[PDB]
Amino acid sequence: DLCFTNVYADSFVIRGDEVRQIAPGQTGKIADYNYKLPDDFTGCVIAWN
């Protein structure tokens, strides 16, 4: 129902236990090294096996 101007999708693959570390404000071997979302991040996180 609500649409947005520019959509950016970051596609990648990570280990299972490393998923919870991707989120605003979260820290860990992911957020602190390779891939980090900002604390104000507004978006949707999708994952599947």
Binding site: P24, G25, T27
Partner: protein
Amino acid sequence: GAISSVLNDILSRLDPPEAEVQIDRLITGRLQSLQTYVTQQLIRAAEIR
């Protein structure tokens, strides 16, 4: 209502998204303190004038 009255203490303990929750309580309360002070000074000023 905040965990502690010191600003750096909250910032040095809670995560960025968690700290903002506690810092807002200090800003909100301290803001009301000024409103109470200014409100009284305006009233007392009327008695002096």
